[PDB]
Each structure stands twice: as C-alpha cells, then as structure tokens.
Amino acid sequence: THSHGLFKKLGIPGPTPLPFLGNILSYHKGFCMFDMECHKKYGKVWGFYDGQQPVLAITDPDMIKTVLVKECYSVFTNRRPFGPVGFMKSAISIAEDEEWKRLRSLLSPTFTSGKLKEMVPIIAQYGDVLVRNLRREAETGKPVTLKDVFGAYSMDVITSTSFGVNIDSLNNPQDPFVENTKKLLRFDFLDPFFLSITVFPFLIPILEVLNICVFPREVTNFLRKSVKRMKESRLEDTQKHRVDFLQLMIDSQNSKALSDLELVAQSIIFIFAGYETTSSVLSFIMYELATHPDVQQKLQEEIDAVLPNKAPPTYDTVLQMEYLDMVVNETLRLFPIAMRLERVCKKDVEINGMFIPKGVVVMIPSYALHRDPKYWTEPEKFLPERFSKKNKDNIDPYIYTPFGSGPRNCIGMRFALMNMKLALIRVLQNFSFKPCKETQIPLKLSLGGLLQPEKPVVLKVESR
Ligand code: HEM
Ligand SMILES: O=C(CCc1ccccc1Cl)NC[C@@H]1Cc2cccc(-c3cccnc3)c2O1
C-alpha cells in the first residue's frame, strides 16, 4: 500500500484500492465490464491499481493521440512487462526502447502492400481447402463449430506464409508443425498465474532464472530448431521463391543487423499473433452474419457482383468490395479482442493539462469506447452502416482503435484484413450460414482475460 495513495494526491477519481491487491477483485466481472463501469461512474479519466502498479485510464481523443502518436518515442514507448519471457524478449510486441526501433525498422518492409499482393495467391489456395473441408461439414446435416474450421484455415495460412509448409491441418493433425503450433493459444491474463504475477511482479525475475517460459518451452525449441534446419535447407535450394516471411527476413539479414535468435523470435510471435486472433474474429463475423441475414445477403451479392461465376478473389478485388469492409469494421468495433491499449510512462511528463508521473501505465479502454453511447448510437446493435462511405468520417480514429494507433500499432493489420476477407469471400460465395438451435441468440462473452464467447459458436452450413 506504499504506492496506493498516488492517484489520491493527484486528485484522480477511481475505485478505492485494497492492501496488497489494489483493484483486482473488481476483475470478477472481466476487463470489459470493469472498464465500462468505471467509465460510467468516473467520467473521462480515472485510475486503479493492478496490485501496486498504478494504471491511469484516458478517454480523451487528443490525449490518446498524445500517448500513442505524439509523445511516443519520447515518453510512451513500451508496454508493461507481462511475464517471464525468456529469449522471446526480442519479440517486437515484447521488445523495448532501442531494440523495438531497430527491429521494427528491420521488419517493416515485410508488411508492404506489394509484399501482401505477392502473398494473396498463397492465402487463396487454403480458402479452397477451407471450402472442401466445409463441404463435408455441411453435408453431414449437423451444426459446425466455427473455431475449428477457421482455426484450421488460419494455421494453413500461417504455415504457408511463414514457411513453405503446405498442410491441411483439419485433415492432417499429426505434422509436427500442426501439433505444436496448435498449442499457441491466447493468454488468459485473469487466470491464477497472470493474476499472481500481476500482484507479485517481484516473482517474475525468480521465474526467469528457473527458465520458466510463459510460452510453451517445448513448442519454442521445436520452432527454434526448425528454423535452424530450414535456413540450411534453403541454403541449398536458393531459388526465387522468397515469397514467405522467413525468406524475407533471411535476405534482409544478409543485406544494425538481425540476429538468428531474433529471427526465430519474430517468426514465432507472428504465428502466435495470427493463429487464434484470425479464427476468433472470423467466428465473430460469421455469427453476426447468421443472426442478421440481411447483411449476409447483400455481402453475398456484392461478392458475386465483383467476382461473377464464383471467381477467385484478388488483391484489387478485395480492396474493391466495400460492404465486406463495412462488415469487418463493425464486427471489430463490437469485439476488439485486445480490449485495452497500454503504454508505460518512462519519465515525468504533462500531457493535455494532466501530470503523468514516472512508472504509471497509461491505458486506453478500446472495448469501453467502442460501446460508449456518447460516440455511437445503439451501441449493442450490429449495424454495418456505421462505416458506409458518407458515415465513416465522423468516427474518431482514436475512439475506434481495433488495431491500435501510432508507430506501435499492429504490424500485420493489412495482412490479417486481407487474410480474413479472403476467407469470407471464398466461403460466402459457396455456403450460407443459418442459426441452429444450439446457437446462443444473445451472444454472451466470457469473463476471463480474453474477448471470446463463453460458448463456442455453432452454426448450420448449407450449400448454394
Ligand atoms: C485480426 C487480428 C488482429 C488484431 C485485432 C490485432 C490487434 C492488435 C493491437 C490492438 C495491437 C496493439 C497496437 C497498439 O497498442 O497500438 C497489436 C500489436 C501488434 N500486432 Fe496485432 N492484431 C491482429 C493480428 C496480428 C497478426 C496476424 C500479426 C502478425 C504479423 C500481428 C502482429 C502484431 C505486432 C508485431 C504488434 C506489435 C507492434 C509493435 O509493438 O511495434 N497482429 N495488434
Ligand atoms: O496477446 C497479447 C495481448 C492480447 C492481444 C493483444 C492484441 C491483439 C489481440 C490480443 Cl488477444 N500479449 C502477448 C504478446 C505481446 C503483445 C503485445 C501487443 C499485441 C500483441 C498481439 C497479440 C495478438 C495479435 N496482435 C498483437 C501481443 O502478443
């Protein structure tokens, strides 16, 4: 309770903390419900304590711009450390200060619009694989869990985009790539482990010296050894097939420098950042399409208009379909799977008429802002027309932050948007999705440290 009076001396409202725990007991409702309630009962700026760590939540759009964009390299550069990380500390989402700039500069060209257009043909083949595996699921006459089929698709894309591994994960669940990477799931930051280390951050160094990695150490060593082999196998072939992430990092390495261990770490973090994130959002999108068939009809018609005769999609055609962009954007508003954006104040600073002392974690409640009635009308409803051509300019880019903002935003934003849209195009033009009985009509979200449905979304699939 030594630092539990900091927000009081600043005259900042917030829930009264308890000794040794701060406000973690209020997390019994979850991150999403906790943030919205505090926004309602405290206004635009409030604070709380994750253990003894003071967290300041800001909702003013100008302040959000100042933290994420304006005073980023100066003040708000890094995120709060989250656990014993091991050699994965060099991951760009985990890197800090100079290493982040050096790694982000070395990794930015991998996510260029030209590079994405060079990867669309690879992501297309596994859309066709998804349709084949979905044709059987629809033929059985029984509901289908979308997480498994989309998880198979995301794995197939990730393996083919990060390496040359071409597999049908839904039908080949034994390839060492499929087995170990299928265990790279999201982190429930409200489980016993993360709750304890948030309350006892002094135990993080103890866990590291015991070599207790937050990521599955068996999966990391397998992937680390695999990359070491694939660099040797590539050292023999050496064709003009540099169309995947690993090759693009290898050639840049030969061209400061990107170390071999740094090379491996970034490869793994791309797998983790894409596996369940893509499948979760795709499941959320298909749920809203099923319970709002009017949207599903217009989207299917627009795909048929741009792509007649079930035509294969294209980078140019994907960037052409506007209602698809409207559907993806609206779903990302209702369900921002990050739920929060965090930066650490590295020095005493005054932003927009507020004093932020050193060490405070400044947070942006993405979920709370996306469903705040002040900026959005009928927030709980699914209305894609919020992002129509003449309506998508009043939306404040710092109140809708599904991929973050500033120089530390999502580096795979356009890859995922392309990857998710390519899946939706290829699936909607071959199948229709109806709500079965088991489908939860009022979709209920989980209370944990993840933005996931409590019950997995099961839907009925029929051929067209
Ligand atoms: C549709 C799924 C995804 C969503 C909704 C999402 C969302 C986000 C958000 C909100 C952030 C934090 C931005 C900020 O704090 O300003 C972030 C960071 C990041 N994401 Fe994603 N992301 C997704 C998929 C991916 C994928 C597939 C990759 C793989 C390339 C990826 C790589 C990263 C990286 C590297 C960062 C950290 C960048 C930095 O700190 O310099 N993300 N993402
Ligand atoms: O996952 C998380 C946080 C949960 C999350 C963040 C962003 C998007 C989705 C999620 Cl569920 N922390 C583990 C590492 C460290 C890190 C920092 C910032 C973003 C990511 C991340 C994760 C997934 C996709 N894009 C970025 C990240 O991964």
In DSSP terms, which residues pair with 56 in a beta bridge? 47, 362
Q: How was this structure determined?
A: X-ray
Q: How far is the CA of 221 from the centre of ligand 1 (A)?
A: 24
Q: Cα(385)–Cα(292) distance, rounded to whole angstroms? A: 13
| Cβ-proximal residues to 300 (8 Å cutoff; 6+ apart), any chain | 428, 429, 432
Structure tokens at 291: 């319970």
Number of Cβ atoms within 10 Å of the Cβ of 111? 18
Ligand closest to CA 335: 1
In DSSP terms, which residues pair with 167 in a beta bridge? none
The verdict on the CB of residue 337 being under 6 Å from ligand 1 is yes
Q: Cα(347)–Cα(169) distance, rounded to whole angstroms? A: 48
Q: How far is the CA of 100 from the centre of ligand 1 (A)?
A: 14
- Tell me the backbone φ, ψ of residue 140, rounded to 5 degrees: -70, -15
Q: Cα(116)–Cα(243) distance, rounded to whole angstroms? A: 10
What does this entry list as its resolution, in Å?
Answer: 3.2
Helix axes 113-139, 413-428, angle to 10 degrees: 40
Q: Cα(427)–Cα(130) distance, rounded to whole angstroms? A: 8
Identity at 144, one-letter amino acid code: V
Index of the ligand 2 atom closest to the CA of residue 272:
23
Number of residues assigned to the chain: 464
The verdict on the CB of residue 133 being under 6 Å from ligand 1 is no
Is residue 144 within 8 Å of 152, Cβ to Cβ? no
Residue to substitute in 79, 93, 193, 446 for testing ligand 2 pocket (most ligand atoms within 8 angstroms of CB): 93
- Ligand 1, atom 21: closest residue by C-alpha: 410
Identity at 75, one-letter amino acid code: V
| Cβ-proximal residues to 460 (8 Å cutoff; 6+ apart), any chain | 143, 144, 433, 434, 435, 436
∠ Cα 180 182 186 (to 5°): 115
The verdict on the CB of residue 274 being under 6 Å from ligand 1 is yes
Element at 351 (helix H, strand E): strand 349-351
- Ligand 2, atom 10: closest residue by C-alpha: 338
- Which residue has 């709500």 as its token pair? 435
- Which residue has 């299928």 as its token pair? 182
Q: Cα(88)–Cα(241) distance, rounded to whole angstroms? A: 28
In DSSP terms, which residues pair with 344 in a beta bridge? 361
The CA-to-CA distance between both ends of the chain, in Å, stands at 63
Q: Cα(366)–Cα(404) distance, rounded to whole angstroms? A: 9
Q: How far is the CA of 252 from the centre of ligand 2 (A)?
A: 25
In DSSP terms, which residues pair with 241 in a beta bridge? none
Q: Cα(128)–Cα(138) distance, rounded to whole angstroms? A: 15
Strand order from edge to edge, sheet including 341-344? 45-50, 53-58, 361-364, 341-344
Cα–Cα distances in angstroms (integers) from residue 78 to residues 170, 266, 348, in the given order? 38, 17, 15
Structure tokens at 147: 């997480």
Cα–Cα distances in angstroms (integers) from residue 83 to residues 18, 124, 145, 193, 365, in the given order? 23, 37, 32, 9, 22
Number of Cβ atoms within 10 Å of the Cβ of 16? 9
Index of the ligand 2 atom closest to the CA of residue 451:
11
Ligand closest to CA 415: 1
Structure tokens at 462: 């029929």
Structure tokens at 185: 């799931």
CATH for the 2-464 domain, from 2.60.40.3680, 3.30.565.10, 1.10.630.10, 1.10.10.10: 1.10.630.10
Is residue 338 within 8 Å of 404, Cβ to Cβ? yes
Is residue 340 within 8 Å of 366, Cβ to Cβ? yes
Q: How far is the CA of 341 from the centre of ligand 1 (A)?
A: 11
Is residue 426 within 8 Å of 313, Cβ to Cβ? yes
- Ligand 2, atom 24: closest residue by C-alpha: 273
Please indicate if the annotation marks 410 as binding a ligand.
Answer: yes
- What's the distance, CA 79 to chain centroid? 15
Reduced to 3 states (helix: H, G, I; strand: E, B; else coil), residue 288 is helix
| Cβ-proximal residues to 396 (8 Å cutoff; 6+ apart), any chain | 61, 375
- Ligand 2, atom 6: closest residue by C-alpha: 338
Q: Cα(366)–Cα(57) distance, rounded to whole angstroms? A: 11
